[PDB]
Write a protein that binds this ligand. Structure first.
Ligand SMILES: CN(Cc1cnc2nc(N)nc(N)c2n1)c1ccc(C(=O)N[C@@H](CCC(=O)O)C(=O)O)cc1
Ligand SMILES: Nc1ncnc2c1ncn2[C@@H]1O[C@H](COP(=O)(O)OP(=O)(O)OP(=O)(O)O)[C@@H](O)[C@H]1O
Ligand SMILES: Nc1ncnc2c1ncn2[C@@H]1O[C@H](COP(=O)(O)OP(=O)(O)OP(=O)(O)O)[C@@H](O)[C@H]1O
Ligand SMILES: [Mg+2]
Ligand SMILES: [Mg+2]
Lengths: 352, 167, 353, 56, 111, 56
């Protein structure tokens, strides 16, 4: 039978750690889509619609990560895109219709399967227009892309280039309906926190009756992002028509020191495991002490790059080690401690 | 460079084997838009025609060497595009090897969309359904003498680029 | 002929849309006009009638596109919907306006007669209002350039319509199609026009004691400003004056109110509540939405500024947690939603059974 | 400036780039070759003139 | 002007060199160039880097690899060559590049 | 401004310009036809409002 949201969440926790809200939004969305496909005859007067999600999280949080994980468990055709490449119709740049083209290739030409699919347009925050003010020049990569996508989200019949997918000899443009395809957008929206503050925080000024916080008591980016409303997104450079096509708005929270420690060992393909494989394929064991992980977490927070910051810290700590160790002989295992992360000490290599 | 052709259904136009239909309507339009032009023919097409074409600066793109002088012979695509030079219109009419080799360098496409159902090993590459936009429309619906259709069309491609002007 | 009357069709349009009376009437009379024209083709008897091209101007989530879909259900003539943002000038790699007629032919079954009696709804007409600052180097493939081609097509000109193309080629018959008898419905939310209209009707404010200063709550809504729209406003927006002249009737929608939103949740044939209720029942659970909660949702939607689309955000959020654990728990019969749930201080009670 | 940075975010991490099929062995007429870029080492380089003051 | 703008690009320089070299990359790779008015693309004392000087610093930032050596992307075609996508490749690691200007005001800076 | 006067400074004293070869019904030459500008009489006019005072 169809899978329940709890099952999906388990699949999403094997790879991601620390984002409970996003796992539910995507789980219910997939649940709805799965039942919305089985009930294709629509034996009722109602015309079941669709709800589009818009994952808004800070850098290095797992937006693109979740999308990839979904493709592992689901069966229907799934596709990935990049809004930075999309351009308005009539230019050398890519067209919105190319998305369906890539979807057809993953659907095996099964129009029915393609008509009920899930897309993940990444970097949806880079296509935002300069500002609410009118644009003096035609923003081919900005509004043009947004206005061109409007019909895809609400429903339309896109003309996909022929002689594609799994059919080389074809001349008649294939028609596909985009009324049952759940488009899950996603962006980083760097700079939104300031826009949100102008609404959630008022009174900031000079005087005895004004408001001052000093950044010590001020709310964090995650907190501010959880209060986002469409009025804010308009300032960021998103036309109101675009937000209306994205009713559901899921907000991610900035990873915590505790969560970063879990990301190093709990996930299926955790960073640490990747490095261990390298040391192991050449013939050496590698392990990291619990205290080491705690130090790494604190340093990563300073970089403000999420989980990506971790790779920098780890690479630096064992840079010299990974350059000379391949030549070393009579070595069986390596052990890194908290001291090595700060440089005061050097890794103790167990000979044997 | 305009790759004048017909692209018969299944690309059965025919170069290695003498043209099945051999109708005056297809040869008249051809002659009309080829006179004095450097038509880059080929060995297979020379076999089917043979006859020196009055005026036409015939350029037989052949994999083998050149023998005749009346009609020039070229061996490489660089030598074939050098003979013609930069003239306003080149009617490449050679073999499949010639047709496809000059396809990346084609601007216009004087097609004929013939319907003749034949078979063989000589075929043309595919044509971009959207890039090649038909600008000219002339209907030549199949007549009694003209067994299949010979609808003449003209195509071309265009694209737009932004400038992002500042101040 | 002309069997359906305006009142009759209005009762069918009200089943799906709540409000926009002026829009409904305008669409009704123009629809009937085409039917009356159909009696003798193009009202050829003596004086020749002009076209009834409509210009739908409504905010987001007002029901512009919805009207087209519901209207097609009751219509018999071929109806094809097209988006103005995918049309490019001829020659370019993008689609050409000529393909609009091709789509119509599919609905018409390649019948020239039925084809020239169809209706063409062009959505997003506000997206090709050229904004460039007279560069003149390149062209606006998605701006004025397209208008020049669409304008000549609406005034009445022969159109290039290559046959369907089942075989390799359609023999380029390019059968001429007259667009003088075809009805065109151009729509789109002209986001920003309200500011343009404001300046023309701006009373003007000062700083002293006798000026006209009003707070944000005391200002006018875009709906009210749209009602006072004039053709000159559309030109400033970046539209050719000849284009708007071809469209004599301009229908200005009205921003939906709390009452209108409450009705939309329960009255329409395929309202949001019914949509979620259907899938909730497809799984085997009954859902009840109290009237008290319905008004709460509308208050929130009015702040999102996305029209009826805002409603789905409020509902999905309220039921996100519920919809996630509901498929796993058993011994559940019905669910009742109270106003507190919408606010977020309570959790929907379950009728365990 | 920023526009070029926004386009490489998916490249340096992994995407499906489309290369014009011209030259070499590029049989696809318009089926643009999909080249996964999740295993391609990128080594950027710059002089960053003025960064020294920011650090100071 | 910088790449992606309405003005000219730094690769045009190599296009003019082919017109004089009969479109022979080998010969073009062993030619001399002279860029006149190299003093008009100098930052107008805009050390803070306020905006993008596509006519000044922007052009200088594009030649840093042409004077040193790089696989330039020659414009599509400015000769007999009919196609455009070809994008002829050329190396500029053995191409002398002279640059002349008047530097009106440098005399004061020196003093 | 000063920039516009700098470009014209060369044109009037000889320049091998690149002009699109089109407008004459598909000109046989398709190599950005050059034109020597060292033989064209450039009669640059203008009404210098104020020069009369400067001279006095
Ligand atoms: C095989 N073949 C190629 C051929 C035939 N029809 C075409 N038709 C069109 N439209 N375009 C072409 N590319 C074309 N090519 C042929 C066959 C005969 C002649 C030929 O004998 N031409 C006569 C013209 C007809 C006549 O007046 O006798 C001539 O004198 O040159 C040339 C091309
Ligand atoms: N919650 C997490 N658990 C484990 N790994 C994570 C998590 N978040 C990020 N990562 C790591 O970061 C990388 C993914 O980065 P992420 O998807 O957060 O970028 P992004 O913000 O989606 O980029 P974009 O702004 O283009 O959407 C992966 O290599 C993954 O290992
Ligand atoms: N009056 C209404 N009654 C019921 N549903 C409505 C109403 N107005 C809008 N909707 C809902 O909104 C959706 C249609 O959106 P709508 O046609 O208003 O977008 P639009 O305003 O045309 O977009 P754009 O502003 O980009 O042109 C439908 O799914 C419909 O359920
Ligand atoms: Mg990512
Ligand atoms: Mg709509």
């Amino acid at each position: 039978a169809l899978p329940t949201p709890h099952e999906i969440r388990n699949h999403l926790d094997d790879y991601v750690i620390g984002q409970e809200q996003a796992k539910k939004v995507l789980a219910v969305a997939v649940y709805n889509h799965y039942k919305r496909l089985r009930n294709g005859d629509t034996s009722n007067g109602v015309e079941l619609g669709k709800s589009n999600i818009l994952l808004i999280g800070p850098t290095g949080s797992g937006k693109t990560l979740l999308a990839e994980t979904l493709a592992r468990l689901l069966d229907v055709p799934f596709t990935m895109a990049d809004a930075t490449t999309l351009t308005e119709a009539g230019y050398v740049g890519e067209d919105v219709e190319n998305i369906i083209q890539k979807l057809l290739q993953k659907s095996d030409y099964d129009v029915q399967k393609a008509q009920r699919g899930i897309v993940y347009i990444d970097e949806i925050d880079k296509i935002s227009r300069k500002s609410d003010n009118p644009s003096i020049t035609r923003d081919v990569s900005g509004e043009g892309v947004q206005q061109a996508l409007l019909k895809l989200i609400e429903g339309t019949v896109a003309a996909v280039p022929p002689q594609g997918g799994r059919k080389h000899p074809q001349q008649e443009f294939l028609q596909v309906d985009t009324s049952k395809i759940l488009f899950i957008c996603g962006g980083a929206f760097a700079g939104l926190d300031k826009v949100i503050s102008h609404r959630v925080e008022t009174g900031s000024g000079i005087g005895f009756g004004a408001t001052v916080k000093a950044k010590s008591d001020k709310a964090s980016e995650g907190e501010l992002l959880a209060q986002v409303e469409p009025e804010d997104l308009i300032k960021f450079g998103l036309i109101p028509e675009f937000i209306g096509r994205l009713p559901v708005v899921a907000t991610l929270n900035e990873l915590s020191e505790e969560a970063l420690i879990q990301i190093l060992k709990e996930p299926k393909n955790a960073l640490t495991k990747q490095y261990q494989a390298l040391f192991n394929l050449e013939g050496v064991d590698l392990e990291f002490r619990d205290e080491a992980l705690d130090a790494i977490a604190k340093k990563a927070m300073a970089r403000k790059t999420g989980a990506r910051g971790l790779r920098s810290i780890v690479e630096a700590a064992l840079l010299d080690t990974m350059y000379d160790l391949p030549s070393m002989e009579d070595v069986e295992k390596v052990v890194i401690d908290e001291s090595v992360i700060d440089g005061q000490s050097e890794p103790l290599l167990i000979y044997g | 460079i305009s790759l004048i052709a017909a692209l018969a259904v299944d690309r059965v136009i025919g170069m290695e084997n003498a043209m099945p239909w051999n109708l005056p309507a297809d040869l008249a339009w051809f002659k009309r838009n080829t006179l004095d032009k450097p038509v880059i023919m080929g060995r297979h097409t020379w076999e089917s025609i043979g006859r020196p074409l009055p005026g036409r600066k015939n350029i037989i793109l052949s994999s083998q060497p050149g023998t005749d002088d009346r009609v020039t012979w070229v061996k490489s695509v660089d030598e074939a595009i050098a003979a013609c030079g930069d003239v306003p219109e080149i009617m490449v009419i050679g073999g499949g090897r010639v047709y496809e080799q000059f396809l990346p360098k084609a601007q216009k496409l004087y097609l004929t969309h013939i319907d003749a159902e034949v078979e063989g090993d000589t075929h043309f590459p595919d044509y971009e359904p959207d890039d090649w936009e038909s600008v000219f429309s002339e209907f030549h619906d199949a007549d009694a003498q003209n067994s299949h259709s010979y609808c003449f069309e003209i195509l071309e491609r265009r694209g737009s680029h932004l400038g992002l002007i500042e101040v």
